[PDB]
PDB file of N, CA and C in Angstrom:
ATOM      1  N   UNK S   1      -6.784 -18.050 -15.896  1.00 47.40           N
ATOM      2  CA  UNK S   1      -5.535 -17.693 -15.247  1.00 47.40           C
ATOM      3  C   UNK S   1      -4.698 -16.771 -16.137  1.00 47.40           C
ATOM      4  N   UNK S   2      -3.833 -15.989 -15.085  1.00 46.67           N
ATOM      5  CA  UNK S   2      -2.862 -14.970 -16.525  1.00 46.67           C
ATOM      6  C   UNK S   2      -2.001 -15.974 -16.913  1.00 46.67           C
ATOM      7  N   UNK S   3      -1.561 -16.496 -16.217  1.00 47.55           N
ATOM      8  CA  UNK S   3      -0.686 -17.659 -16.743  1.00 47.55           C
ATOM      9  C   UNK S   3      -0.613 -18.319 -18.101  1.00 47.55           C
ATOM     10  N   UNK S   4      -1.818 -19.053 -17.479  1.00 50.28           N
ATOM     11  CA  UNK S   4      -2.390 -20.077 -18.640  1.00 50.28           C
ATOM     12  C   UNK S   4      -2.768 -18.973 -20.130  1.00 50.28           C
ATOM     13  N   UNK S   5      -3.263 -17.572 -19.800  1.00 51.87           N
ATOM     14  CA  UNK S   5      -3.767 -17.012 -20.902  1.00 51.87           C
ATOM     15  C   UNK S   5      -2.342 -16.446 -21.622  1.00 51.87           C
ATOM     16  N   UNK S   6      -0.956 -16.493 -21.027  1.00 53.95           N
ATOM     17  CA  UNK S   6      -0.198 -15.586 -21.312  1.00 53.95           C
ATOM     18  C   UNK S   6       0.987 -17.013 -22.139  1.00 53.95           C
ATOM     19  N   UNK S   7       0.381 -17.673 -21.020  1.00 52.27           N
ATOM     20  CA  UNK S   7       1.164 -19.927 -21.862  1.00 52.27           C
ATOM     21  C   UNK S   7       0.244 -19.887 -22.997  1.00 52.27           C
ATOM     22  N   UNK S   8      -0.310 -19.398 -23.189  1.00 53.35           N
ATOM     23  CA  UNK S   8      -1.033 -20.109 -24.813  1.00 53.35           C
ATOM     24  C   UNK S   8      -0.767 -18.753 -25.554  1.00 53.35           C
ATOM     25  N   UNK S   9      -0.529 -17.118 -25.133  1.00 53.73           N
ATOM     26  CA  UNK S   9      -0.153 -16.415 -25.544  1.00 53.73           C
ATOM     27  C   UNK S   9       1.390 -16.748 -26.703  1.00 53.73           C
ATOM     28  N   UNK S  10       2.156 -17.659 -26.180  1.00 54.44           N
ATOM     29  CA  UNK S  10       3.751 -18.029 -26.428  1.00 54.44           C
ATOM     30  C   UNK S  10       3.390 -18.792 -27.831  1.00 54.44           C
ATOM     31  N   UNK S  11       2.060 -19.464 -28.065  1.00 53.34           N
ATOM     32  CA  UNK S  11       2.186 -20.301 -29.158  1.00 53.34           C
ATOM     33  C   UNK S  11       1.399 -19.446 -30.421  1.00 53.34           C
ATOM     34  N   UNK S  12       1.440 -18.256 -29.872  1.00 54.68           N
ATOM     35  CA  UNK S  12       0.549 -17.199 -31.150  1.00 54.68           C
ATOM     36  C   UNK S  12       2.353 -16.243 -31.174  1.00 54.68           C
ATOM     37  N   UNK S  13       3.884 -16.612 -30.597  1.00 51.85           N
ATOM     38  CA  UNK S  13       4.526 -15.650 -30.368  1.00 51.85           C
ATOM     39  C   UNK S  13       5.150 -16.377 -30.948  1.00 51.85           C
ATOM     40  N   UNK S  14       4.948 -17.548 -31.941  1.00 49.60           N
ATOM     41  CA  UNK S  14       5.896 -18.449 -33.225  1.00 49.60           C
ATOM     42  C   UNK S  14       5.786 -17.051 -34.231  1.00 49.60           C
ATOM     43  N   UNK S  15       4.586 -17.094 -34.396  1.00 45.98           N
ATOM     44  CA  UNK S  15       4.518 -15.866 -35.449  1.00 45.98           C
ATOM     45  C   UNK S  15       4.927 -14.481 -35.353  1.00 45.98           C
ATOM     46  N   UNK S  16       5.850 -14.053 -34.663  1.00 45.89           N
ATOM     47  CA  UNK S  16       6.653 -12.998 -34.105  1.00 45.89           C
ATOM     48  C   UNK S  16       6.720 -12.356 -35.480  1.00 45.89           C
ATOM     49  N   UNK S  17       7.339 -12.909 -36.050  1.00 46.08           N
ATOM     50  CA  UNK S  17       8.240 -12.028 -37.336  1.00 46.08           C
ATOM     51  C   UNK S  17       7.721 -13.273 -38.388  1.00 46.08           C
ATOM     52  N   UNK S  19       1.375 -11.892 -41.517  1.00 48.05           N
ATOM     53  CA  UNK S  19       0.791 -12.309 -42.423  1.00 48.05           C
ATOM     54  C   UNK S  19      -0.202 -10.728 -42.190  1.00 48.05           C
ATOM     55  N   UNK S  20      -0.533 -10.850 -41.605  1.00 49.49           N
ATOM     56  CA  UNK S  20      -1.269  -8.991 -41.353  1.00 49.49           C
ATOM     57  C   UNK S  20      -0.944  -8.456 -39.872  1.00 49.49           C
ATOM     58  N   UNK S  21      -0.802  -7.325 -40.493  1.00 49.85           N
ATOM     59  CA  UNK S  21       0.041  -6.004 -39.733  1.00 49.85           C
ATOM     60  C   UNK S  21      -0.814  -5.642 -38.080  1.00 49.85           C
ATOM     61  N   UNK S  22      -1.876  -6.997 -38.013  1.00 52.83           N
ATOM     62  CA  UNK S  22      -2.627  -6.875 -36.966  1.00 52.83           C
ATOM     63  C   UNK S  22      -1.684  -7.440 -35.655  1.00 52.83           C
ATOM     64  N   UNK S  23      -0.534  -8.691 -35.850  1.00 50.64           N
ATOM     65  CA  UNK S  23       0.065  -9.131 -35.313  1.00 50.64           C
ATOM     66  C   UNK S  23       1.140  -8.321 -34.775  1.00 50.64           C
ATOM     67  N   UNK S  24       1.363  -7.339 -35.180  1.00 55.02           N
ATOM     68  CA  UNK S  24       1.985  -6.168 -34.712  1.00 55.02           C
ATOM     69  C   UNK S  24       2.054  -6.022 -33.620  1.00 55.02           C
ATOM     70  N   UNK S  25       1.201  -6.181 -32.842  1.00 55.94           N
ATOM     71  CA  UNK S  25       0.657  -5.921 -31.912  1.00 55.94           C
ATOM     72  C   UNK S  25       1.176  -6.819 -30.785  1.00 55.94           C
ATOM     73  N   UNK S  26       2.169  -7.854 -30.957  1.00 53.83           N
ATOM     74  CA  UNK S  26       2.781  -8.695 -30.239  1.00 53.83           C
ATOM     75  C   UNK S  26       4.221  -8.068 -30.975  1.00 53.83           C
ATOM     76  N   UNK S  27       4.418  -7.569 -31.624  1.00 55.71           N
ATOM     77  CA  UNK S  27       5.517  -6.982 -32.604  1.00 55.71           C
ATOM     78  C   UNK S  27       6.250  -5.713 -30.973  1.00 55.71           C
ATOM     79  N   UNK S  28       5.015  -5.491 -30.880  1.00 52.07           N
ATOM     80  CA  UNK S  28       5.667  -3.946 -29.919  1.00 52.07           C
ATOM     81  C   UNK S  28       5.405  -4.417 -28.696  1.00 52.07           C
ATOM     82  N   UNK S  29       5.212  -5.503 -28.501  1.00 52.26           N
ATOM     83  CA  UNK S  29       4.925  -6.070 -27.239  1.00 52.26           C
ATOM     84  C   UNK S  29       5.692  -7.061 -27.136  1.00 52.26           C
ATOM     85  N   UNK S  30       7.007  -7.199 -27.776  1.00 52.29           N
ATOM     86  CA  UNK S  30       8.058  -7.887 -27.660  1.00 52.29           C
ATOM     87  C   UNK S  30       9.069  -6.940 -28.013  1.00 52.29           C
ATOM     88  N   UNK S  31       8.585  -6.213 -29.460  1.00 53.16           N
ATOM     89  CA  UNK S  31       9.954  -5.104 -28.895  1.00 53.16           C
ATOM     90  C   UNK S  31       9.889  -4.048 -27.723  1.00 53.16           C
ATOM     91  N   UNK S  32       8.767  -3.828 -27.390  1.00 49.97           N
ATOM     92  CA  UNK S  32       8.940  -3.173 -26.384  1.00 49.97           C
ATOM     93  C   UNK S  32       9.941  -2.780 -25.125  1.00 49.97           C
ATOM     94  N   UNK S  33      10.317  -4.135 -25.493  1.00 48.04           N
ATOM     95  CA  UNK S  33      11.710  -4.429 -24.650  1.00 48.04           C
ATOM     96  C   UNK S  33      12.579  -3.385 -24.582  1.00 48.04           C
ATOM     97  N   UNK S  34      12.831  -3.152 -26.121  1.00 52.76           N
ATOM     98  CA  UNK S  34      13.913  -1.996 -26.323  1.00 52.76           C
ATOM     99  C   UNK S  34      13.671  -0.856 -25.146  1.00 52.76           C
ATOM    100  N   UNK S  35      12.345  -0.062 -25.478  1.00 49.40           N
ATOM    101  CA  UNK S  35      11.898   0.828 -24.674  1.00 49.40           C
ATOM    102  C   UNK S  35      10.694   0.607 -24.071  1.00 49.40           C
TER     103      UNK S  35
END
């Protein structure tokens, strides 16, 4: 489900702010901005 893949997405999105790979939820939360 996207759901379920995007609900377990939220518990990898503690680590928002260890490698620069996580970034990648970095611009996919700031993205917001733009």
């Amino acid at each position: 489900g996207i759901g379920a893949l995007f609900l377990g997405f939220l518990g990898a999105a503690g680590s928002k702010k260890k490698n620069e790979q996580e970034l990648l939820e970095l611009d996919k939360w700031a993205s917001l901005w733009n």
